[PDB]
Amino acid sequence: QGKLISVKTDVLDLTINTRGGDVEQALLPAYPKELNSTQPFQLLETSPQFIYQAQSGLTGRDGPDNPANGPRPLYNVEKDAYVLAEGQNELQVPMTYTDAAGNTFTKTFVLKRGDYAVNVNYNVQNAGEKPLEISSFGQLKQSITLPPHLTFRGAAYSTPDAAYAAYAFDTIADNENLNISSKGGWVAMLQQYFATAWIPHNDGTNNFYTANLGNGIAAIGYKSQPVLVQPGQTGAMNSTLWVGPEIQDKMAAVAPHLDLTVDYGWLWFISQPLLVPRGS
Numbered sequence: 680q681g682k683l684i685s686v687k688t689d690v691l692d693l694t695i696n697t698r699g700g701d702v703e704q705a706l707l708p709a710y711p712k713e714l715n716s717t718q719p720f721q722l723l724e725t726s727p728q729f730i731y732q733a734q735s736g737l738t739g740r741d742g743p744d745n746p747a748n749g750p751r752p753l754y755n756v757e758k759d760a761y762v763l764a765e766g767q768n769e770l771q772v773p774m775t776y777t778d779a780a781g782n783t784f785t786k787t788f789v790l791k792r793g794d795y796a797v798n799v800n801y802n803v804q805n806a807g808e809k810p811l812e813i814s815s816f817g818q819l820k821q822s823i824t825l826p827p828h829l830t831f832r833g834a835a836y837s838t839p840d841a842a843y844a845a846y847a848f849d850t851i852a853d854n855e856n857l858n859i860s861s862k863g864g865w866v867a868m869l870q871q872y873f874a875t876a877w878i879p880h881n882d883g884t885n886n887f888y889t890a891n892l893g894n895g896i897a898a899i900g901y902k903s904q905p906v907l908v909q910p911g912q913t914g915a916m917n918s919t920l921w922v923g924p925e926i927q928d929k930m931a932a933v934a935p936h937l938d939l940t941v942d943y944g945w946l947w948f949i950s951q952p953l954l955v956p957r958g959s
Contacts, residue, residue: 681753686772688763688790691797691922692719699744699751700774700786702733705922707873722873722922728826730896731868732819733875733920735799739814739905743776743784752776752784768792781806795923796933801916803908811908815916817877818900819868820892823848830871831950834899835942836887837934838864843941845869846889847949851897857889865934866899869925869942876921878934879903 681698692706705723712718723731736744736751743752754774763770772788782805789798805811821832834846838861846857862884867876879885883904890898908914919933931937 681751682756682759684756684758684772685760685762686770686788686790687761688770688792688794690793690795691790693723693788693797693922694725695772695788697754697756697774699734699736700754700788701735702920702922705733707923710924720873722875726826729822729824731821731875733877733922734818734820734900735816735877735918735920737784737801737803737813737815737916738902740812742813742815743778744816754786763790763792782811795921795926795929797920797922799918799920801914803914803916805908805910805912805914808910810910811914812905813908813914813916814902814905815879815918816900816902817866817879817918817920818890818898819866819875819877820896820898821848821868823852823895823897831946832868832870833942833946833949834866834868834889834897835939836861836864836866836899837936837938838862838887842936843938845942845945846899847946848897851889851891851899854891856891857887857899859887860884861887861901864901865937866901867921867939868899869939869946872925873923874921874925874930874939876930876934877901878919878921880917880919881906 683694686693694704696703703725706719708719710720738745754776756774761772770790774786776784785802787800865876865878886902
């Protein structure tokens with residue numbers, strides 16, 4: 680039972696679940712829902728017939744988002760609604776959770792004006808006797824079937840060794856999944872004109888994976904290498920979420936070597952039905 684908070688700027692309307700801090704819906708006010716609509720375009724969404732979420736949290740031995748340590752952390756929040764105020768160029772949305780040992784975990788969303796790159800920052804204060812072992816993760820998950828409603832989509836990533844790469848949702852659904860290591864890099868879900876991406880900011884070697892979550896859900900994500908938070912200290916785990924138009928210039932400012940060019944070419948080609956006519 681985690682409430683839903685509203686987080687608004689000029690370009691994004693996010694709903695964030697307070698149990699785990701997953702982004703459950705993202706609307707884009709600069710883009711109409713369809714031709715002639717009042718409504719903004721819906722990228723991330725949570726509904727009975729379609730889900731598309733940017734999930735994140737702290738896993739590893741001592742991470743609270745690790746199911747073995749119990750249910751996802753219920754964060755406390757100041758308000759239910761945050762809105763970029765006039766004259767202000769940045770919005771901060773901090774949420775705090777306190778462990779059953781006084782360990783404090785602060786997850787903070789940082790939005791900037793006109794900016795589709797949302798910073799997602801943790802601070803972990805260890806108030807106990809042993810080091811806390813923690814991996815952060817970013818997952819993007821999506822229903823394979825759109826709502827029947829009665830133009831292609833896929834997963835991508837890049838690493839220092841992988842200039843372009845792409846997984847069709849079919850492949851993921853076939854249990855043929857990515858499982859690799861990447862220092863830096865990024866993972867994304869693509870559609871036409873719009874993209875979602877997680878870009879970790881750390882010094883380690885991430886695990887980049889795709890996953891069949893079953894019942895029609897595909898996923899791509901990263902799990903950053905485990906870090907120790909000493910009894911002394913407060914640790915920080917940072918990543919950036921792109922949630923917006925597929926503007927390469929803007930994305931590449933946040934992820935160097937962002938080039939989707941060859942990914943789109945593959946996904947465009949692969950999603951077109953085959954017809955070989957009989958001779959005549």
